[PDB]
Amino acid sequence: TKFSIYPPIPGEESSLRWAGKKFEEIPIAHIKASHNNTQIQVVSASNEPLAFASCGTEGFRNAKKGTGIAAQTAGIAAAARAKQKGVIHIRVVVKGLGPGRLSAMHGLIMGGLEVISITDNTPIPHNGCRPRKARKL
Amino acid sequence: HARLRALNGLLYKALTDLLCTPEVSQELYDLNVELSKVSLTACRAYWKTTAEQNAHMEAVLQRSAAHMRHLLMSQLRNVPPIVFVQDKGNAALAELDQLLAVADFGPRLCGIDHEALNKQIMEYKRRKDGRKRAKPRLEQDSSLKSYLSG
Amino acid sequence: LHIPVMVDEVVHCLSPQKGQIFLDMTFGSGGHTKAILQKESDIVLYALDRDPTAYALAEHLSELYPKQIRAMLGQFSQAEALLMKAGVQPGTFDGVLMDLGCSSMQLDTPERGFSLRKDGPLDMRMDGGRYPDMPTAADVVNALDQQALASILRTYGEEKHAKKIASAIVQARSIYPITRTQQLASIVAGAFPPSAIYTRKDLLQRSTHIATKTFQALRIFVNNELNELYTGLKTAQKFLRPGGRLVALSFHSLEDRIVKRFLLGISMTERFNLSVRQQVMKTSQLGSRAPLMWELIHKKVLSPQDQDVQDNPRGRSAKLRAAIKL
Amino acid sequence: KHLKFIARTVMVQEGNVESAYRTLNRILTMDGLIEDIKHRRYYEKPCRRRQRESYERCRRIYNMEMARKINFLMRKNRADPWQGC
RNA sequence: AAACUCCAGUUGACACAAAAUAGACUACGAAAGUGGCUUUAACAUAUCUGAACACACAAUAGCUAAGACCCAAACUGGGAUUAGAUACCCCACUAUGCUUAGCCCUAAACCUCAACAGUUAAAUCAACAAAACUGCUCGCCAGAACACUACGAGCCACAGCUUAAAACUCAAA
Numbered sequence: 001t002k003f004s005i006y007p008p009i010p011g012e013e014s015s016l017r018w019a020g021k022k023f024e025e026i027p028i029a030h031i032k033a034s035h036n037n038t039q040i041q042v043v044s045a046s047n048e049p050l051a052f053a054s055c056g057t058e059g060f061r062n063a064k065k066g067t068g069i070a071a072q073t074a075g076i077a078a079a080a081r082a083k084q085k086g087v088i089h090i091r092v093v094v095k096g097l098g099p100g101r102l103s104a105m106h107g108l109i110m111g112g113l114e115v116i117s118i119t120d121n122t123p124i125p126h127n128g129c130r131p132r133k134a135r136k137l
Numbered sequence: 138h139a140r141l142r143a144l145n146g147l148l149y150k151a152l153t154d155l156l157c158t159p160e161v162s163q164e165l166y167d168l169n170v171e172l173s174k175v176s177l178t179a180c181r182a183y184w185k186t187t188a189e190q191n192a193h194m195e196a197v198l199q200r201s202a203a204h205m206r207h208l209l210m211s212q213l214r215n216v217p218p219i220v221f222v223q224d225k226g227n228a229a230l231a232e233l234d235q236l237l238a239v240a241d242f243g244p245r246l247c248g249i250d251h252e253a254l255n256k257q258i259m260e261y262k263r264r265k266d267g268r269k270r271a272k273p274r275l276e277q278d279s280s281l282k283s284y285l286s287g
Numbered sequence: 288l289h290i291p292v293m294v295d296e297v298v299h300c301l302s303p304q305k306g307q308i309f310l311d312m313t314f315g316s317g318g319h320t321k322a323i324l325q326k327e328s329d330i331v332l333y334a335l336d337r338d339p340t341a342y343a344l345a346e347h348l349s350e351l352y353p354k355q356i357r358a359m360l361g362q363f364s365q366a367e368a369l370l371m372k373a374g375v376q377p378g379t380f381d382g383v384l385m386d387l388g389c390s391s392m393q394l395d396t397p398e399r400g401f402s403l404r405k406d407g408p409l410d411m412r413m414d415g416g417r418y419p420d421m422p423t424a425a426d427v428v429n430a431l432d433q434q435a436l437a438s439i440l441r442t443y444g445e446e447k448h449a450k451k452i453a454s455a456i457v458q459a460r461s462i463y464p465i466t467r468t469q470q471l472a473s474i475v476a477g478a479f480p481p482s483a484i485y486t487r488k489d490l491l492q493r494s495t496h497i498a499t500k501t502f503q504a505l506r507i508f509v510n511n512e513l514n515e516l517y518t519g520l521k522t523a524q525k526f527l528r529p530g531g532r533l534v535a536l537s538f539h540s541l542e543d544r545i546v547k548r549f550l551l552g553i554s555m556t557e558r559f560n561l562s563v564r565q566q567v568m569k570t571s572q573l574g575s576r577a578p579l580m581w582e583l584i585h586k587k588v589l590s591p592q593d594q595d596v597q598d599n600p601r602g603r604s605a606k607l608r609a610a611i612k613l
Numbered sequence: 614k615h616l617k618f619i620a621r622t623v624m625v626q627e628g629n630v631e632s633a634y635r636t637l638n639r640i641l642t643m644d645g646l647i648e649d650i651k652h653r654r655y656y657e658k659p660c661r662r663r664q665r666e667s668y669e670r671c672r673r674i675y676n677m678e679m680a681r682k683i684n685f686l687m688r689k690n691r692a693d694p695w696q697g698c
Numbered sequence: 699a700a701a702c703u704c705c706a707g708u709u710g711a712c713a714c715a716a717a718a719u720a721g722a723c724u725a726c727g728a729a730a731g732u733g734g735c736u737u738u739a740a741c742a743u744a745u746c747u748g749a750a751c752a753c754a755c756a757a758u759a760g761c762u763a764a765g766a767c768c769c770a771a772a773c774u775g776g777g778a779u780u781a782g783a784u785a786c787c788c789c790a791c792u793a794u795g796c797u798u799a800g801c802c803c804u805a806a807a808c809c810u811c812a813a814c815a816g817u818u819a820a821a822u823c824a825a826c827a828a829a830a831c832u833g834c835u836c837g838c839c840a841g842a843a844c845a846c847u848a849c850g851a852g853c854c855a856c857a858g859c860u861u862a863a864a865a866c867u868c869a870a871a
């Protein structure tokens with residue numbers, strides 16, 4: 001068949017399935033990639049938290065949290081905890097432009113989870129609040 | 138120099154367009170390779186590296202380099218050969234780690250020379266025991282006086 | 288009487304108590320020692336100093352307290368072996384107090400030549416002749432080359448005009464030996480227009496002799512104050528009891544920098560007066576420390592009060608640092 | 614408020630997560646979202662923003678003109694038809 | 699480091715704040731200015747020129763009063779950094795940026811190009827900027843510095859703005 005990068009539309013019956021589940025039912029891996037930290041949380045389609053992880057929770061502290069390896073470790077831990085609850089396929093929803101933005105996904109892959117879709121939810125203000133002044137460095 | 142910079146930019150754009158389109162090659166289109174840099178002297182191409190998949194990408198690029206040059210000749214027709222350089226961050230680190238895995242380890246103040254100055258002082262003890270600058274434009278010349286004299 | 292500067296805060300930070308070992312590497316006049324003995328009489332105190340007159344004062348205090356205070360004459364470098372033979376080889380020092388600068392009896396005496404106000408031999412040597420082979424400031428100025436003297440004044444003396452003052456000193460010395468402190472002061476004054484004799488002003492914004500910095504430099508280079516201070520700090524750390532209290536007083540930028548970098552474990556070779564922007568640039572260039580061993584009693588330095596400045600203007604620039612060995 | 618998993622969503626093809634992420638990043642770069650976030654990290658003062666936009670427009674115009682000139686002139690980059698003269 | 703730890707992530711509800719992409723457009727307005735949507739009202743003059751002061755405007759900052767307050771933020775406090783203070787960095791927070799009604803009347807308010815009309819022929823033209831000019835009108839300048847000053851006068855302005863000297867000094871600027 002012809003693969004389309006566009007996600008299947010909720011409310012429309014698609015042939016695509018994963019473990020006998022529809023795309024609307026696949027659990028959701030929210031990734032937040034800040035400059036100083038990276039947080040990962042898996043939730044069900046019904047917004048039920050199943051696993052959470054972060055660089056700080058994995059023992060890394062201060063500047064060491066900003067490394068990509070910390071985000072990879074967080075992804076590994078989150079994937080292990082989610083897989084303990086039966087999570088197999090996930091939809092990745094990544095926000096922020098932190099160093100671990102991709103590494104966390106790799107960790108999930110290393111954790112055993114299968115990523116079927118990558119979604120960017122970076123909060124981009126359509127001319128919203130005023131950011132802080134530029135650093136004089 | 139600026140012309141060569143624009144030529145490098147045009148080569149980068151053309152190579153990116155060839156990579157993106159599926160008409161060039163199904164393999165190349167499926168790879169989705171992205172170029173970090175393109176520089177003409179021969180042409181050096183630098184693409185971002187993701188090991189096994191990296192090796193596969195390098196092999197496919199090396200196989201399709203001739204076809205890519207042929208397609209570029211259709212456009213900029215006089216295109217020098219294109220060299221693809223895999224950017225494994227610092228490639229020295231990657232090669233070093235590969236060899237190290239392969240390799241065998243067997244069984245497991247004051248800012249001065251105070252001493253020199255002290256020696257010099259001991260040696261001494263033992264031996265004991267502005268103006269105006271005329272402006273360049275105001276300097277006189279007597280050549281005209283000599284010429285008028287005779 | 289130049290009262291020991293912030294001696295109350297020194298006593299507070301040290302917190303003397305009965306049956307504790309406290310080493311005063313800079314006994315000198317002993318005002319700090321006297322206050323410590325006032326707080327505690329059973330304290331076992333060591334009075335180390337390089338001035339034989341300071342050793343005599345320590346022996347006088349020993350006449351006052353036969354074995355509570357123990358005298359010691361020698362430099363910081365010798366202090367290691369001196370204390371090892373003294374009977375404190377395992378260290379375990381409950382407190383260490385390190386003053387810096389010139390002793391009041393040293394500065395007042397013109398024969399030592401520690402002040403330009405009073406004439407005397409250009410000695411500027413803390414040792415009172417215990418090692419006569421020890422160089423004197425007169426030999427230093429007469430011997431050292433133009434570049435060597437310029438470097439000495441630039442680094443030790445924090446002097447902007449080293450290239451000029453060193454040349455002037457060499458020119459003067461080529462005519463006559465520089466054997467008088469006031470002669471050297473006159474020479475340095477001649478290196479500048481006479482109006483510049485008192486143009487330089489102290490941190491108190493009070494006029495001082497222009498040659499003062501130069502004098503300071505020579506003093507340090509005569510006594511190797513920076514190197515001997517570093518050795519003394521290392522020996523104290525080696526001999527300080529874990530959890531012991533170390534209190535230091537620094538009367539100028541160089542010694543305070545050395546003490547602070549030792550306490551915080553910073554590399555001595557690191558640039559001086561670093562700003563946050565400079566640190567960021569350094570790390571950006573380096574982006575392509577040793578574990579801490581102290582706990583600061585006072586994170587910020589302690590400076591004398593304005594009234595104390597009026598009483599003892601010489602102690603205005605004193606900065607106090609208190610830490611505990613970890 | 615909008616429906617989710619439609620905007621900035623890329624389906625992973627045969628488990629090729631890296632390729633899907635690269636496609637998503639390229640889409641965001643083409644739409645300028647990545648540069649938008651980078652510029653919105655700190656406030657860019659309006660005079661600075663106007664100067665930067667004018668400089669970018671001038672640079673793009675100059676680059677396009679230079680590319681056109683080079684393409685036009687490279688038609689003469691062939692073997693010399695009158696060698697020896 | 700400090701700070702917070704009813705802190706963070708997900709979901710839902712949720713603004714008197716600010717107006718991605720369009721915009722690689724070059725539009726509107728006298729200038730300052732103006733880039734979310736809708737609606738209403740609305741963008742002077744059938745010859746030009748015409749004011750430090752008349753008439754009316756005039757970014758930002760600022761003042762007065764009353765509200766709003768997400769965020770940003772002088773000042774301040776704390777933390778770092780520093781020999782040290784301040785600053786650069788981090789955090790918290792205020793005036794302030796917002797609304798209403800007044801005031802203040804400043805700018806590198808700069809297309810550093812006065813307005814109107816005409817010309818592309820001569821010599822094109824000190825240089826650079828931005829091709830060179832002509833007709834006409836108003837404003838302005840007459841060495842530098844003293845001086846976006848002093849005095850006088852005017853002003854809701856009171857550490858203010860507008861107008862604006864002279865003496866001494868120099869042979870340059």
Ligand SMILES: Nc1ncnc2c1ncn2[C@@H]1O[C@H](CSCC[C@H](N)C(=O)O)[C@@H](O)[C@H]1O
Nearest residue numbers: 313315316317318336337362363389390413
């Ligand atoms: N390396 C060193 N070894 C021993 N004593 C030293 C020394 N460097 C300086 N000193 C001495 O330390 C003292 C510095 S000033 C003395 C201050 C004294 N604590 C008081 O009662 O005020 C002088 O006695 C000086 O000679």
Ligand SMILES: [K+]
Nearest residue numbers: 666719721733
């Ligand atoms: K825009």
Ligand SMILES: [Mg+2]
Nearest residue numbers: 746747748813
């Ligand atoms: Mg008119």
Ligand SMILES: [Mg+2]
Nearest residue numbers: 756757802803
């Ligand atoms: Mg205004």
Ligand SMILES: [Mg+2]
Nearest residue numbers: 767792793794
């Ligand atoms: Mg506020």
Ligand SMILES: [Mg+2]
Nearest residue numbers: 730757807808
């Ligand atoms: Mg303007």
Ligand SMILES: [Mg+2]
Nearest residue numbers: 812813836837
């Ligand atoms: Mg006009």
